[PDB]
Amino acid sequence: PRILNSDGSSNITRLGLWLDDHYHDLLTVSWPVFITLITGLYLVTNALFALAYLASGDVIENARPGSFTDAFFFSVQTMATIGYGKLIPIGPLANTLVTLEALCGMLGLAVAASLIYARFTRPTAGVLFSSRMVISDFEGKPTLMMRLANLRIEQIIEADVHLVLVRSEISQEGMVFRRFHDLTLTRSRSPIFSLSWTVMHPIDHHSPIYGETDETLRNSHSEFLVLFTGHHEAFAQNVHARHAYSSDEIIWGGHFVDVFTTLPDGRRALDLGKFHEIAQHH
Amino acid sequence: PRILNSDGSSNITRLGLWLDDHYHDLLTVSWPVFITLITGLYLVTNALFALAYLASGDVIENARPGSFTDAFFFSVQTMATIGYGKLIPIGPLANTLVTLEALCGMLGLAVAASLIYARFTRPTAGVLFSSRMVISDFEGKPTLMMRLANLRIEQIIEADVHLVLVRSEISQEGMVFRRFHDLTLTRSRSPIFSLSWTVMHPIDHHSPIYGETDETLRNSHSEFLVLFTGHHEAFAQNVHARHAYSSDEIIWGGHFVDVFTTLPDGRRALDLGKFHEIAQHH
Amino acid sequence: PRILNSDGSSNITRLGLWLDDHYHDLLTVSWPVFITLITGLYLVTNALFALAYLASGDVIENARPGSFTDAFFFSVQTMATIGYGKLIPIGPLANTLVTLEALCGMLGLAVAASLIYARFTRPTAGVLFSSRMVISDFEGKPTLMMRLANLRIEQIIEADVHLVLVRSEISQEGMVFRRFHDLTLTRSRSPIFSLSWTVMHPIDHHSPIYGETDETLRNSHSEFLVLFTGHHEAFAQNVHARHAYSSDEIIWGGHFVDVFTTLPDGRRALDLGKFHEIAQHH
Amino acid sequence: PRILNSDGSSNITRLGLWLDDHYHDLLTVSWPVFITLITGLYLVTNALFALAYLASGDVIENARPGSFTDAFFFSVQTMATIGYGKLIPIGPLANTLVTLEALCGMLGLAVAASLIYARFTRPTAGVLFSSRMVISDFEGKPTLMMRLANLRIEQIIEADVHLVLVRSEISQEGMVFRRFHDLTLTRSRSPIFSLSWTVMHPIDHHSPIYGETDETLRNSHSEFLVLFTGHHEAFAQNVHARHAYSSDEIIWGGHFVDVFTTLPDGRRALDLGKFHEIAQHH
Ligand SMILES: [K+]
Ligand SMILES: [K+]
Ligand SMILES: [K+]
Ligand SMILES: [K+]
Ligand SMILES: [K+]
Ligand SMILES: [K+]
Ligand SMILES: [K+]
Ligand SMILES: [K+]
Ligand SMILES: [K+]
Ligand SMILES: [K+]
Ligand SMILES: [K+]
Ligand SMILES: [K+]
């Protein structure tokens, strides 16, 4: 079983555990549940105002006396500010509730808009991760590599990548634990990420995987977490993306196929159909 | 008396000291006070428009002449744009005030929405702090430790922790002062914080608490401030959380109980009922 | 003449130089000019719709034929969605313009709200700068110092300070220029800034002002720029503040008076009436 | 052919490749296409409600039976909340659809406002790049230089610049590739960028262009990418700007003309008409 899923999420059951986190819940529920909650409060509030009008008496013009239906639809036309003009308030109290209901309708619109903006304005990075890593010689050193691709034409500014090894380790007190190792990279910051980025960890005598083999990486249940962050121009907003690799997904001796090609016209070109293609000696 | 409270706030009386900071005050007052302020301005503005209409004359259809009540409710139905159709403006001046009032109503809605969004969209980190710290051997060194837990299923990106010692010190000029010491950590940046994080300060010969005891930490009135920051996925927004520990709350020789367990099914599992459990030799 | 003003702004005349920067201009003009611009477009757009209705003919119920006044106020009641019900559209064209005008009114509300939110949500740091700097011995080294104070009860997270020397220098090619020197600080990052912060630059043999005197600092026209940045809890938003000091404003041998006092009750207390008080030997 | 355009964008044809990225597309399409899309959905939704009302029967007051036109305009006056009062719902079903349509109108306004705010609030840095670079002696070292200018009076806080060399290189395994070199700068962070900034890369024995000539830079197809980032005070928001230079655009032996002048009055002054002027020995 893999501790980390391919999407970079955790695979641990949270056994540890309706308005204790209401703001978080309103932003994280599905859209149909969200729209349903908004609708319920919308209807519930009008029903409450309908009861308020009736409690005052027959204070709605052209309304059947004691009718909740008529009072409710008058509440709707008031809170929403439709104000057709057939059902209208009679007397100071009805007109005072109307003054209140209008305020309530504006406040509710502001709240609903605030929540919708927070849910909408959560963009995706649009970044593709290579399905595998490779370990192969680069500049005379065995180098762990993966690569990323921008799926959009807009560029990503101040793009950072973090490659973390997660493996079970034993302390000199005999304590066995999962340790996280930030892997030194040749380039961790790309000021402008536009097309493709080959992320590289030279396995030098300081690397946590120096001397390791495919087999020793399994025995430590070694996994590799990748985090990408950057400022996306399409959104003028920060974005991120995560991914995880198991030891099984390292191609020892592999080489990523070049995704940059030259056309017959001589134009430089990016072919992302080879993004997952790895070359290997047989 | 503790200079810092458990929540990381200061315990100093600010003896040093209604529109001098109005924007800050509108975002920091309680919600009932905020709603009351919005309501007051709402009613006050309509009253001002009611006086404006009356000052022009009897320019409201179906309104009792000289009646503020009728003019006020006509202002309400105009600013809120209900426009039932019984009370309507008569003449160019009343219609000009209506044109103005509608603008005022839109501007006021935009302002109210701006303030509501700023007050709403202030999420909490959802991070739990261990009730105590511990000092115990890790990797052959006495190590000060505390730990954090994510109370939500959504992950926190680029999570930083800062462990600061605050203690009374004396300069070589004889000046006694409170100094803040950033404590070097084994891991200060966790690219993805999902479940639990054990924060560690190896007390090596460079540590400000190297050689200190429980007693010497009291005599210096030593306290420990913790700051957590990160980008929460649930909100696509930055969050933070703070906490403070006294010397009394360091368990010398303690060991945090492991919150990660394996179920009979073999699934890895997180039990946060042991988050505050510390093991100690007796 | 001082190149930098006390507020950290530049004192250089920009001799180098209406819709070339319209978005910037809408956020930077004063509020009365902004409200005036919004009003003008509001009235101008209704006038344009009034002409559109008249161009179709007498298509407004209860409107005097050919009257711009009546058509204009009907546009107002339509765009603002008041819809009293006396002036109403006649025929498909008038009703089509109404369908368009309503859309225009919603789009204009969204635009106006977007601009208002951007102008409103620009908080101030609430940070006070000491009126002077001091140079005095701290930990056995002459140390340039200034200090900051939080004027609010809410804390500022991840607070950074940058102390820059600006002075006229000569290159070994003989070129005279203004150079900026980032001055090393004992603490440049305070994870939680709550009350007061004494910023310190030890003048060691690496300091750009090592060996300088009050007189040599004048001859180089030396100035000191201060930048403060942090995440304010009151706003859950980043804030900043700037300030500048001339050489005249350095008190050689000065010592800032302690703003932390103990009350008769024994409570620790912050007295900001001594924030600008400096002690000097005579 | 230049791999990077002067604006810092990539010049590679993306051969690699309507609701697969709908949120990105709504923010990136032109404004006329955006307004057209909003209009279409606006009209389409009203048409759907018109059909709903007719499907119930003749439930609209003063409406011609079976007329889509009349039902459609009644939908408009309901969703937009105009509510003139001539066309009004008859019976519980029509009034229930009205209750729904009003909600739909509010939700659609919130969505439209959210998208408009995201598209509007994407400010430009207002930063000018010198049309050329220069290599000339500074402080006794040949130094690559370009410079930036603030086109606005508002200052930019925590301004960063990154100067990257891009050139074709060969690995010791014989692999030819484009490598990116972060060029060390004398100043990469200017805490307050107000007027002009001369960015400098001393070509010391560690520089990737140490020993290179104008000719060798061509043979490697060397290009220089510039990224500027900062917090603009006019917007209280982060901004950025990018630019690219070819080897052809380096003036060997050049010196940027000083843009700072003193007036007859003695006031320091900034003349940006000389921003692109370079002095060269002939
Ligand atoms: K309305
Ligand atoms: K409304
Ligand atoms: K309104
Ligand atoms: K209305
Ligand atoms: K009406
Ligand atoms: K409206
Ligand atoms: K809004
Ligand atoms: K908004
Ligand atoms: K916003
Ligand atoms: K925002
Ligand atoms: K009517
Ligand atoms: K509406």
Short mmCIF file of C-alpha atoms in Angstrom, two decimals, chain A residues 8-224:
data_model
loop_
_atom_site.label_atom_id
_atom_site.label_comp_id
_atom_site.label_asym_id
_atom_site.label_seq_id
_atom_site.Cartn_x
_atom_site.Cartn_y
_atom_site.Cartn_z
CA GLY A 8 0.11 13.92 -3.77
CA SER A 9 -2.66 13.27 -1.24
CA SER A 10 -2.33 11.20 1.92
CA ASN A 11 -3.65 7.64 2.12
CA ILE A 12 -4.18 7.50 5.90
CA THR A 13 -7.59 6.87 7.45
CA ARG A 14 -8.42 9.81 9.75
CA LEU A 15 -10.14 7.89 12.53
CA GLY A 16 -9.43 10.78 14.92
CA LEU A 17 -12.85 12.13 14.01
CA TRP A 18 -22.88 20.98 11.94
CA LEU A 19 -21.74 24.59 12.43
CA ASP A 20 -18.32 23.99 14.03
CA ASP A 21 -16.55 24.93 10.77
CA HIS A 22 -19.38 26.54 8.83
CA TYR A 23 -17.26 28.87 6.70
CA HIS A 24 -14.93 26.07 5.59
CA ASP A 25 -17.92 23.81 4.94
CA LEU A 26 -19.68 26.39 2.77
CA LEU A 27 -16.61 26.63 0.52
CA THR A 28 -15.88 22.89 0.36
CA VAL A 29 -19.30 21.31 -0.17
CA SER A 30 -20.24 20.44 -3.74
CA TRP A 31 -21.99 23.07 -5.84
CA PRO A 32 -25.40 21.28 -5.78
CA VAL A 33 -25.26 21.07 -1.99
CA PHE A 34 -24.15 24.71 -1.84
CA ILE A 35 -26.97 25.88 -4.11
CA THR A 36 -29.40 23.76 -2.10
CA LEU A 37 -28.26 25.36 1.16
CA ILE A 38 -28.59 28.86 -0.31
CA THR A 39 -32.06 27.99 -1.62
CA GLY A 40 -33.21 26.60 1.72
CA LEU A 41 -32.16 29.71 3.62
CA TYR A 42 -33.75 31.81 0.88
CA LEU A 43 -37.10 30.04 1.27
CA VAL A 44 -36.84 29.72 5.05
CA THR A 45 -36.23 33.45 5.47
CA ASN A 46 -39.21 34.40 3.29
CA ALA A 47 -41.43 32.01 5.24
CA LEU A 48 -40.31 33.75 8.44
CA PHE A 49 -41.21 37.15 6.99
CA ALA A 50 -44.55 35.80 5.74
CA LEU A 51 -45.36 34.76 9.31
CA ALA A 52 -44.27 38.21 10.50
CA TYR A 53 -46.67 39.99 8.14
CA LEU A 54 -49.58 37.72 9.05
CA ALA A 55 -48.80 38.15 12.76
CA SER A 56 -49.47 41.86 12.25
CA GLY A 57 -52.80 41.14 10.55
CA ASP A 58 -54.22 41.58 7.06
CA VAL A 59 -51.64 44.17 6.07
CA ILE A 60 -50.96 43.05 2.47
CA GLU A 61 -53.02 44.62 -0.30
CA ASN A 62 -54.92 42.22 -2.56
CA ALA A 63 -53.86 39.30 -0.34
CA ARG A 64 -56.32 36.68 0.87
CA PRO A 65 -56.60 37.12 4.65
CA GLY A 66 -54.67 34.61 6.72
CA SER A 67 -53.11 33.10 3.59
CA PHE A 68 -49.48 32.10 4.06
CA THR A 69 -49.08 31.54 0.31
CA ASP A 70 -49.97 35.16 -0.48
CA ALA A 71 -47.85 36.55 2.35
CA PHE A 72 -44.91 34.36 1.32
CA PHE A 73 -44.94 35.52 -2.31
CA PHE A 74 -45.26 39.11 -1.10
CA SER A 75 -42.15 38.51 0.99
CA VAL A 76 -40.41 37.17 -2.13
CA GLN A 77 -41.32 40.20 -4.24
CA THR A 78 -40.11 42.44 -1.40
CA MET A 79 -36.82 40.75 -0.46
CA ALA A 80 -35.90 40.29 -4.13
CA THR A 81 -37.12 43.88 -4.76
CA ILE A 82 -39.30 42.82 -7.71
CA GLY A 83 -42.19 44.86 -6.30
CA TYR A 84 -44.79 44.08 -8.96
CA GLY A 85 -47.26 46.40 -7.22
CA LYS A 86 -50.32 44.19 -6.68
CA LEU A 87 -49.35 42.97 -3.20
CA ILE A 88 -48.26 46.01 -1.18
CA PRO A 89 -47.88 46.78 2.52
CA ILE A 90 -50.61 48.44 4.58
CA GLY A 91 -49.72 50.50 7.63
CA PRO A 92 -46.53 51.39 9.49
CA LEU A 93 -45.73 47.90 10.77
CA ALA A 94 -45.96 46.15 7.40
CA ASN A 95 -43.96 49.01 5.88
CA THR A 96 -41.41 48.68 8.69
CA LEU A 97 -41.01 44.95 8.08
CA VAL A 98 -40.60 45.80 4.38
CA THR A 99 -37.84 48.27 5.26
CA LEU A 100 -36.19 45.50 7.28
CA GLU A 101 -36.71 42.79 4.66
CA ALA A 102 -35.09 44.89 1.94
CA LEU A 103 -32.02 45.32 4.15
CA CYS A 104 -32.05 41.56 4.77
CA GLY A 105 -32.20 40.98 1.03
CA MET A 106 -29.21 43.21 0.37
CA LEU A 107 -27.20 41.66 3.21
CA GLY A 108 -28.05 38.18 1.93
CA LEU A 109 -26.97 39.11 -1.59
CA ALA A 110 -23.64 40.40 -0.28
CA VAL A 111 -23.09 37.22 1.74
CA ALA A 112 -24.04 34.97 -1.18
CA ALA A 113 -21.76 36.93 -3.52
CA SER A 114 -18.87 36.73 -1.05
CA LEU A 115 -19.17 32.94 -0.81
CA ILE A 116 -19.57 32.51 -4.58
CA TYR A 117 -16.46 34.60 -5.27
CA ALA A 118 -14.42 32.58 -2.76
CA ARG A 119 -15.56 29.30 -4.34
CA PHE A 120 -15.17 30.46 -7.95
CA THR A 121 -11.78 32.17 -7.67
CA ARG A 122 -9.75 29.04 -6.89
CA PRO A 123 -7.85 28.39 -10.13
CA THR A 124 -5.93 25.29 -11.15
CA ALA A 125 -2.26 25.41 -12.11
CA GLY A 126 -2.74 23.60 -15.42
CA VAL A 127 0.51 21.68 -14.91
CA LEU A 128 1.16 18.14 -16.15
CA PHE A 129 3.47 15.77 -14.26
CA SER A 130 5.49 13.06 -15.98
CA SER A 131 4.05 9.65 -15.13
CA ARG A 132 7.51 8.37 -14.11
CA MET A 133 10.86 9.49 -12.78
CA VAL A 134 14.24 8.43 -14.17
CA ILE A 135 17.72 7.98 -12.74
CA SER A 136 20.47 8.47 -15.32
CA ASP A 137 23.82 10.17 -15.73
CA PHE A 138 23.76 13.94 -16.22
CA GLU A 139 26.97 16.00 -16.15
CA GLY A 140 28.78 12.90 -14.89
CA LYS A 141 26.47 12.16 -11.95
CA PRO A 142 23.52 9.78 -11.55
CA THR A 143 20.57 12.16 -11.40
CA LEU A 144 16.98 11.58 -10.32
CA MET A 145 14.62 13.42 -12.67
CA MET A 146 10.97 14.14 -13.30
CA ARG A 147 9.45 16.87 -15.45
CA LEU A 148 6.52 19.28 -15.63
CA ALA A 149 4.61 20.80 -18.54
CA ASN A 150 2.45 23.92 -18.82
CA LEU A 151 -0.87 22.95 -20.42
CA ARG A 152 -1.79 26.60 -21.11
CA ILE A 153 -0.34 29.38 -23.22
CA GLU A 154 -0.11 31.82 -20.30
CA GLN A 155 3.15 31.80 -18.38
CA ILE A 156 3.72 31.10 -14.68
CA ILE A 157 5.96 33.52 -12.78
CA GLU A 158 8.36 32.72 -9.92
CA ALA A 159 7.71 29.00 -10.30
CA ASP A 160 9.09 26.84 -7.49
CA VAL A 161 9.46 23.07 -7.31
CA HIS A 162 10.15 20.99 -4.19
CA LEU A 163 11.17 17.33 -4.46
CA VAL A 164 10.82 15.52 -1.13
CA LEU A 165 11.84 11.95 -0.33
CA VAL A 166 9.66 10.18 2.25
CA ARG A 167 11.02 6.96 3.75
CA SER A 168 10.96 4.94 6.95
CA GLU A 169 14.10 5.57 9.00
CA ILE A 170 15.53 4.45 12.34
CA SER A 171 17.08 6.83 14.87
CA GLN A 172 20.15 5.99 16.93
CA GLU A 173 17.77 5.62 19.88
CA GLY A 174 16.09 2.85 17.88
CA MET A 175 12.98 4.85 16.97
CA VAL A 176 11.51 4.01 13.55
CA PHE A 177 9.76 6.92 11.84
CA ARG A 178 8.89 8.42 8.46
CA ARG A 179 11.39 11.16 7.61
CA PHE A 180 11.04 13.82 4.91
CA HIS A 181 14.16 14.80 2.94
CA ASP A 182 14.24 17.97 0.87
CA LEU A 183 16.24 16.91 -2.19
CA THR A 184 18.72 19.49 -3.47
CA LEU A 185 17.87 20.50 -7.04
CA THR A 186 19.96 21.98 -9.82
CA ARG A 187 17.13 24.48 -10.37
CA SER A 188 14.42 24.94 -7.73
CA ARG A 189 13.26 28.38 -8.96
CA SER A 190 12.41 29.09 -12.58
CA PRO A 191 11.58 32.83 -12.85
CA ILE A 192 9.31 32.17 -15.87
CA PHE A 193 7.85 28.70 -16.51
CA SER A 194 6.34 28.67 -20.00
CA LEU A 195 6.56 25.20 -21.55
CA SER A 196 8.53 22.35 -19.98
CA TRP A 197 10.81 22.01 -16.95
CA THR A 198 13.05 19.00 -16.28
CA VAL A 199 13.56 18.87 -12.50
CA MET A 200 16.88 17.32 -11.47
CA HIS A 201 18.39 15.97 -8.24
CA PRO A 202 22.08 15.06 -8.64
CA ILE A 203 22.71 11.99 -6.49
CA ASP A 204 26.02 13.12 -5.01
CA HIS A 205 27.65 11.81 -1.83
CA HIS A 206 25.29 14.07 0.15
CA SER A 207 22.07 12.79 -1.43
CA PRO A 208 19.75 10.79 0.86
CA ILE A 209 19.54 8.21 -1.95
CA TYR A 210 23.30 8.02 -2.58
CA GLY A 211 24.14 4.33 -2.83
CA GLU A 212 20.50 3.24 -2.82
CA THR A 213 19.15 0.73 -5.34
CA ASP A 214 15.69 -0.03 -6.66
CA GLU A 215 15.51 -2.77 -4.02
CA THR A 216 16.69 -0.70 -1.05
CA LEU A 217 14.19 2.02 -1.99
CA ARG A 218 11.38 -0.55 -1.73
CA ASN A 219 12.58 -1.87 1.64
CA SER A 220 12.45 1.69 3.00
CA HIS A 221 9.06 2.16 1.25
CA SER A 222 10.58 5.24 -0.34
CA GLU A 223 8.21 7.72 -1.99
CA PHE A 224 8.76 11.04 -3.74
#
